[PDB]
Amino acid sequence: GLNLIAAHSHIRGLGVDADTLEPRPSSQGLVGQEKARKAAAVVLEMIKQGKIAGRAVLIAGPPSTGKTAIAMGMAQSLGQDVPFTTLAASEIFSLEMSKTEALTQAFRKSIGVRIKEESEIMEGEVVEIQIDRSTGGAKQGKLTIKTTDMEAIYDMGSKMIDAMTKERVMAGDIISIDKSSGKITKLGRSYARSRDYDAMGVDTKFLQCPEGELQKRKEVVHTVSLHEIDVINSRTQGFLALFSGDTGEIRSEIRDQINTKVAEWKEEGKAEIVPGVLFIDEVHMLDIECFSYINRALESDLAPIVIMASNRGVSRIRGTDYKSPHGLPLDFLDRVVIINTHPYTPDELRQILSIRAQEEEVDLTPDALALLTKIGQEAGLRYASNLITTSQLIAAKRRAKQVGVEDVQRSFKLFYDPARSVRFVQESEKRLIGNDGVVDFSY
């Protein structure tokens, strides 16, 4: 399809027992990190129950230790039923709006309003339309329509005749009508009328006739975030700003009205509130002004749960000239719990490389897998995973059916790992541009 293979495509979930929250040593694409995956499983329970508001969890650990992997596992195990918002901290630095507005919008995207609405909908194959134009048009008309089970004629009002002539409905068209509003959508064309469609090229697809009742009360479930309600109410076609993104700094009295309106709908039972989760990757890229905002944005009943990831040691907080653990001020870290991810053992590296090789289309000999595992221990899990693709392409060019040690060794020779590339810049120092800007171009 459209969706290609990416770094995380193998992650299908958290790999955890739904009864006990015990993580399995490998399942759903996640290997190891068991203490961290158990803690992430407890956080999913908090999210799905919705009771607790504005918890902030930090996933802290070295690079390539599965902090994003666990975050993808949580997103995949919540599924489409819950708002999950994936923010890179670099995105808050908009030119369109202030940092705190961008953080408000991110929080507001992460609470859903869930609304259930019925419509009668009419769906069937068109047997016939006649229309009388006299000559101004649309004076009267009749629709005959069927399913495999039922056939009816309808007398049409003139605005339905305008809908029919707008959407060029003809005999054989399979249509649905949202009769609460009278938009008509041409679901397709019946195969039984294929020869009527003289203007349709050979690439044209055809459906079978619809089934059952011509009219059904379909029930639709909508989830709309608080941010969408905010943006709708910002200008005459404010919803367009959900796509073009040119929302200004939306005024807070609009949001306060909406908060009141949604609490009204909750108590009336017209709607339900669905608290989601905001994920902030590389949270250390936020500055001291962002953190002091987030402190108190977490205190609302309409706060999502927040989940954050950091690679950083004791490091300088942005927007100040002093250093703190994770790169985050202690003022903020007081309201956070930390989940820590560890480095992998060799058998965990072997398993992750195997899963990555099976998610890719790669037939991998046992000695190539052993070599890639040793490279993993010495050069890191990402570099070994990047060599899988490379070795497959080398093996394919020599027409080989399997990736052998020979192909991994070409890959290892052609593409340096970070440690070898660091050595390369240290040995090549006079030929590279140094931090003083000096370089020598001569032989």
Partner 1 sequence: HRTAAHTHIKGLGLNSSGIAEKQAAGFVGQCAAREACGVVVDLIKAHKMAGRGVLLAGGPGTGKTALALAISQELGTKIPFCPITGSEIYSTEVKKTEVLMENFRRAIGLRVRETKDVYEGEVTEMTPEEASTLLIGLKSARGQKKLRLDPSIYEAIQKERVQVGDVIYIETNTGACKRVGRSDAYATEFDLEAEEYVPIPKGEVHKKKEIVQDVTLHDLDVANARPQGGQDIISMMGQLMKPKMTEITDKLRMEINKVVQKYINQGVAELIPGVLFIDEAHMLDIECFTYLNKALESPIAPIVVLASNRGIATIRGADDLKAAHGIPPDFLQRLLIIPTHPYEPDEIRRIVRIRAQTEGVQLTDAAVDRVAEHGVRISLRYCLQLLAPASILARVNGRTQVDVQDIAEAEELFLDARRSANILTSTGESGGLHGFIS
Partner 2 sequence: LPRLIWCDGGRLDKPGPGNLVAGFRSKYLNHMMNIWTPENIRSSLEGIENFTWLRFVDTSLQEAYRASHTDVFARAVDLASKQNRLGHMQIVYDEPEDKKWTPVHALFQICERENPKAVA
Partner 3 sequence: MKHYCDVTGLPAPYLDPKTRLRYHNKEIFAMIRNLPQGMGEQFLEARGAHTV
Which residues bind to partner 3, rule: CB under 8 A?
127, 144, 147, 149-154, 212-215
Say if CB 124 and CB 146 are below 8 A apart. yes
Task: Give the separation between CA 381 and CA 398, rounded to whole angstroms.
Answer: 26
Nearer to partner 2, 150 or 242 (CB): 242
The SS3 assignment for 185 reads strand
Choosing from 7, 192, 220, 432, the residue that interacts with partner 2 (CB under 8 A) is: 220
Binding residue positions: 7-8, 10, 31, 64-69, 296, 335, 344, 382
Q: Which residues from 226-265 bind partner 2, rule CB under 8 A?
A: 228-229, 232-233, 236-237, 239-240, 242-243, 254, 257-258, 261, 265
Say if CB 48 and CB 18 are below 8 A apart. no
Q: Which stretch binds partner 2 (CB under 8 A): 115-123, 136-144, 147-155, 406-414?
A: 115-123
Q: How far is the CB of 436 from a copy of itself (least distance, A)?
A: 5
Q: What is the 3-state secondary structure (H, E, C) of 85-109?
A: EEEEHHHHCCCCCCHHHHHHHHHHH
Told to check if 199 binds partner 2 by CB under 8 A, we report no
Burial of 345-379, coded b for 16+ CB within 10 Å and e otherwise, reads eeebbbbbbbbbbebeebebbeebbebbbebbeeb
Burial tier of 228 (Cβ tally within 10 Å: 0-12, 13-18, 19+): middle
Nearer to partner 1, 366 or 390 (CB): 390
Q: How far is the CB of 279 from partner 2 (least distance, A)?
A: 17
Task: Give the separation between CA 270 and CA 155, rounded to whole angstroms.
Answer: 35
Binding partner of 262, given a copy of itself, partner 3, partner 1, none, CB within 5-8 angstroms per partner class: none
Nearer to partner 1, 150 or 289 (CB): 289
Question: Between the CA of residue 216 and those of 52, 136, 196, 322, what are the distances in Å?
Answer: 39, 34, 29, 65
Q: Which residues from 164-183 bind partner 2, rule CB under 8 A?
A: 167, 176, 178, 180-181, 183
Taking the CA of residue 290 as centre, how many other CA atoms within 13 Å lie in the half-sphere pointing to its CB?
23
Nearer to partner 1, 53 or 150 (CB): 53
Please report which helix (H) or strand (E) contains residue 324, including its range: strand 323-325
Nearer to partner 2, 84 or 383 (CB): 84
Question: Between the CA of residue 109 and those of 31, 84, 328, what are the distances in Å?
Answer: 31, 9, 24
Nearer to partner 3, 26 or 144 (CB): 144
Q: Which of 408, 412, 372 is nearest to 391 (CA)?
A: 408
**Look-up of token digits 């041409």:** 186
Binding partner of 223, given a copy of itself, ligand ADP, partner 2, none, CB within 5-8 angstroms per partner class: partner 2
- Site size toward partner 2 (CB under 8 A) is 44
Nearer to partner 2, 223 or 340 (CB): 223
Binding partner of 329, given partner 1, a copy of itself, ligand ADP, none, CB within 5-8 angstroms per partner class: a copy of itself
Q: Which of 301, 353, 344, 309 is nearest to 327 (CA)?
A: 309
Q: How far is the CB of 189 from partner 3 (least distance, A)?
A: 21
Binding partner of 267, given partner 3, partner 2, a copy of itself, none, CB within 5-8 angstroms per partner class: none
Q: Which x/- pattern over 381-420 shows residues binding ligand ADP (rule: CB under 6 A)? A: xx--x-----------------------------------
Q: How far is the CB of 145 from partner 2 (least distance, A)?
A: 17
Binding partner of 110, given a copy of itself, partner 3, ligand ADP, none, CB within 5-8 angstroms per partner class: none
Burial of 182-191, coded b for 16+ CB within 10 Å and e otherwise, reads eebeeebbbe
Task: Give the separation between CA 126 and CA 145, rounded to whole angstroms.
Answer: 4
Told to check if 188 binds partner 2 by CB under 8 A, we report yes
Told to check if 32 binds ligand ADP by CB under 6 A, we report yes
Nearer to partner 1, 167 or 366 (CB): 167
Q: Which of 278, 242, 267 is nearest to 55 (CA)?
A: 278
Choosing from 23, 54, 57, 65, the residue that interacts with ligand ADP (CB under 6 A) is: 65
What pairing do the DSSP bridges indicate for beta strands 111-132 and 215-225?
antiparallel
The alpha carbon of 134 is separated from its chain's Cα centroid by a whole number of angstroms, namely: 54
Interacting residues with partner 2 (CB under 8 A): 80, 112-113, 115, 117, 119, 167, 176, 178, 180-181, 183-188, 202-205, 207, 220-224, 228-229, 232-233, 236-237, 239-240, 242-243, 254, 257-258, 261, 265, 270-271
